[PDB]
């Protein structure tokens, strides 16, 4: 097999050669793809450098309080930083702004029982719960901050309670010249008088019948703040510990907005630990055995309602 085996090979080098020029078409193409692929993923890298969007935004407008902010030009209810006159460090609060120009500065809100109000002294002093720009979250602002605002300038502040049963029926209750003292006074609560409101002056005490003294013993004006780890109540046994919350007891209460959150409103003595009522009650509106569905306590300069010319 001279020029026979070799005849099969002197041209068989052009048979397989169709895998050299052909196998450089790929290397030159594949290579190029990557060059641009590198570019593509580079655009991608760019796309994700940013962190997720946090729907909670804060406003750049500060003030002594929400009304002061409302004056500055605030139009929407949201979170803001305020720093009361006597205050040293500012803080975030929830401002409720209506179209009429009123800037309510809210300090307490219940709405789902999502947060536990069985908090100690410090916790009730510094504040707890969560602030949302849509006020769709429950919280307590903190005795200290409340003190600071209701006391700066010493110009008439009015407290407004807003309740709502489990039937979407609401009712207010206002109090003129509202104010809360310093910690040295155990954050005592005082108001001049009960102004309007269709919910009823539960702060004035109520007669539960159990005894004739109930009526006084359930008033809260002039009462000091009380937590399980800090008495100061008129009761000789600690209402706070028993009723489990933070409030201004006076041999207990008639109005109890930091009470246990009972789903559906109606509760019973058996449900309660010590047997006494501890729901979010407001005697002058509903029974001591009906916990509200929602509760809100906001304040605003008194003049903002007693308005004129």
């Amino acid at each position: 097999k001279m020029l026979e085996e070799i005849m099969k090979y002197e041209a068989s080098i052009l048979t397989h050669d169709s895998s050299i020029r052909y196998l450089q078409e790929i290397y030159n193409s594949n290579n190029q793809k990557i060059v641009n692929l590198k570019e593509k993923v580079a655009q991608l890298e760019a796309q994700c450098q940013e962190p997720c969007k946090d729907t909670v935004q804060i406003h750049d407008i500060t003030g002594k309080d929400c009304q002061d902010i409302a004056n500055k030009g605030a139009k929407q209810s949201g979170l803001y930083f305020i720093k009361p006159l006597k205050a040293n460090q500012q803080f975030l609060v929830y401002c409720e702004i209506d179209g009429s120009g009123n800037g309510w500065t809210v300090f307490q809100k219940r709405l789902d029982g999502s947060v536990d109000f069985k908090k100690n002294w410090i916790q009730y002093k510094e504040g707890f719960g969560h602030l949302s720009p849509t006020g769709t979250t429950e919280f307590w602002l903190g005795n200290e901050k409340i003190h600071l605002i209701s006391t700066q300038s010493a110009i008439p502040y009015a407290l407004r309670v807003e309740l709502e049963d489990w039937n979407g029926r609401t009712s207010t209750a206002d109090y003129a010249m509202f104010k809360v003292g310093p910690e040295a006074d155990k954050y005592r609560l005082t108001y001049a008088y009960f102004a309007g409101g269709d919910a009823g002056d539960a702060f004035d005490g109520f007669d539960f019948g159990d005894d004739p003294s109930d009526k006084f013993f359930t008033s809260h004006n002039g009462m000091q703040f009380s937590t399980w780890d800090n008495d100061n109540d008129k009761f000789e046994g600690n209402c706070a510990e028993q009723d489990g919350s933070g409030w201004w007891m006076n041999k207990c209460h008639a109005g109890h907005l930091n009470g246990v959150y009972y789903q559906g409103g109606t509760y019973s003595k058996a449900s309660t630990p010590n047997g006494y009522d501890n729901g979010i009650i407001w005697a002058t509106w509903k029974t001591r055995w009906y916990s509200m569905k929602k509760t809100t306590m906001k304040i605003i300069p008194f003049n903002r309602l007693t308005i004129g010319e």
Binding site: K33, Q49, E126, H130
Partner: protein, 312 residues
């Protein structure tokens, strides 16, 4: 006979040695299309961003510690303000590890954030501080983030602050590295790092460098006293042989590199925690490394850095 030249075996030799050279050069040619696709898809996913609704806790303070003292006891995103001049900022507070009060300063856990960023992002901070849980009103989960050098500096400089660094391999084992003393200078001093009193099971990669390395090589991996270096701005231990050798590089993390590292918490997040030089972009130790523990070539599953004022 006189050199029979049987390069006719080559006619059986070349054919086989070309049957591969084709099969692979074509398999690459296919792999590209998938990735091309993969990228397109992601770019589509990115037209629309990720979001979170991080409602703000009522309690606040100079930092985590103060907060826990002020009754705040759930580990979550809190709003703090250290210096009464700084605009308050969000941060994640670990309220339960070593008695809580830990201001989370850096966190790795799932590779969801590019850490290979230039100088500025490291200064300001970047990433996601916290994310929503199942669907709670609050952000109880920490995302991957970097608080930013300025904030860190300021913080460590309010007083004796102690650093706690935890990490975990892909098999769920977890160690820690604790330093009683921790400090980061202002930008002027190039965020110069300083640490003391190490105590932990992780290995002191920071002060003692790589336990595995010897002399020359070991001390060139020590991080105490080093400056911060981002791929764009370099202040590591090196011979300025132009853009050649730089410890920090493309998509490589900013860190306090010496003649490189012994630990790299901001390295690249390789999945499974196992990698090789051909996997590494630059054939280097790109990963989220801690040589003193798993050595080089092992990107931990989890790595975190948090501080707390000492208060001895």
């Amino acid at each position: 006979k006189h050199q029979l030249y049987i390069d006719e075996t080559v006619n059986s030799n070349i054919p086989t040695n070309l049957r591969v050279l084709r099969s692979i050069l074509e398999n690459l040619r296919s792999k590209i299309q998938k990735l091309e696709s993969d990228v397109s898809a992601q770019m589509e996913y990115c037209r629309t961003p990720c979001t979170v609704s991080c409602n703000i806790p009522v309690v606040s303070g100079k930092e985590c510690e103060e907060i826990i003292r002020k009754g705040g006891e759930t580990s979550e995103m809190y709003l703090i303000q250290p210096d009464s001049s700084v605009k308050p900022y969000r941060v994640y507070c670990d309220m339960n590890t070593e008695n809580g009060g830990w201001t989370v300063i850096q966190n790795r856990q799932d590779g969801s954030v590019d850490f290979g960023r230039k100088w500025d992002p490291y200064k300001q901070g970047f990433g996601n501080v916290a994310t929503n849980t199942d669907g709670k009103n609050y952000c109880g989960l920490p995302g991957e983030y970097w608080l930013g050098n300025d904030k860190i500096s300021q913080l460590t400089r309010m007083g004796p602050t102690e650093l706690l660094i935890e990490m975990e391999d892909w098999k769920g084992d977890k160690v820690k590295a604790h330093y009683g003393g921790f400090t980061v200078q202002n930008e002027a001093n190039k965020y110069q790092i300083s640490v003391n009193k190490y105590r932990g099971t992780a290995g002191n990669a920071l002060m003692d460098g790589a336990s595995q390395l010897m002399g020359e090589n070991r001390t060139m991996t020590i991080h105490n006293g080093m400056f911060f270096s981002t791929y764009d701005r370099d202040n590591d231990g090196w011979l300025t042989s132009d853009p050649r050798k730089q410890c920090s590089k493309e998509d490589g993390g900013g860190w306090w590199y010496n003649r490189c590292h012994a630990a790299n918490p901001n390295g690249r997040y390789y999945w499974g925690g196992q990698y090789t030089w051909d996997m590494a972009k630059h054939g280097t130790d790109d990963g989220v490394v801690w040589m003193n523990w798993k050595g080089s070539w092992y990107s931990m599953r989890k790595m975190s850095m948090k501080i707390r004022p000492f208060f001895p």
